[model samples]
Target: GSNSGRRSAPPLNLTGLPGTEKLNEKEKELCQVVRLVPGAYLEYKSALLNECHKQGGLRLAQARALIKIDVNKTRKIYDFLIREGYITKA
Candidate 1:
């Protein structure tokens, strides 16, 4: 009877990204606004994808791919959006 070698959360940098004065503090703000968007996730993800260069905005979608964000959290919110039909599943 043994229950060993279970999966554990991997080690992550857990450090703030380096950029112009406190960019992450601003970027990490998504964790705050993620659940409180006045617009659709469509615009949200789009503006945040790479708007930092274009419109100087957010990019949680990008961070999720690279690991600074949580995939589970993304889906968690995604489920909410889908259920409410805020955006299409397609």
Candidate 2:
């Protein structure tokens, strides 16, 4: 196979596999703000900050501290999706 000019494939369901559910949860929660408001994540942290505020504001640093994620884990969620061919890295 000539390894060149490859694009992402459609998303696949990784359900039913042990431990995959956890990944799903992480991805979902990580993107909850964006899902609620498309592009909000990149538009301005305020939108998300507000939502998280409405939901009980937790700043980026606070959220990271509160959750089980560090900077690496935060980036890993995005990386995992890209690696699985469901999305491209930003």
Worst 10-residue lDDT window for candidate 1 reads 14-23
Weakest ten-residue segment in model 2 by summed lDDT: 34-43
Q: Look at candidate 1 and give me any clashing residue pairs.
A: 48-58
lDDT of each: 0.37, 0.37
User: What are the models' TM-scores?
Assistant: 0.28, 0.25
- Candidate 1 per-residue lDDT, tens place, 1-90, comes to 763322241123212222212223333343334432223333444443443345433234543453333566565444443454443343
Query: Which sections of candidate 2 miss by over 4 Å?
Result: 1-16, 19-55, 75-90
What local lDDT does model 2 show for residue 31?
Answer: 49
- Between which residue pairs do clashes occur in model 2? 53-57
In candidate 1 the C-alpha lDDT for residue 61 amounts to 54
- How does residue 43 of candidate 1 score in lDDT? 43
